[PDB]
Amino acid sequence: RNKLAYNMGHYAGKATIFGLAAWALLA
């Protein structure tokens, strides 16, 4: 039931900086 510019778009920012760092840089 959750979705919003802050949900998707804002998390996309976090996930690309943090999450992706684990995958790109850390893996």
Side-chain angles (χ1 to χ4, degrees):
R1 189 192 182 225
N2 65 273
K3 191 197 70 182
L4 192 69
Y6 294 93
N7 172 267
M8 294 279 63
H10 195 47
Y11 270 82
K14 279 64 171 62
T16 308
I17 184 62
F18 306 135
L20 214 79
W23 241 233
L25 297 174
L26 179 67

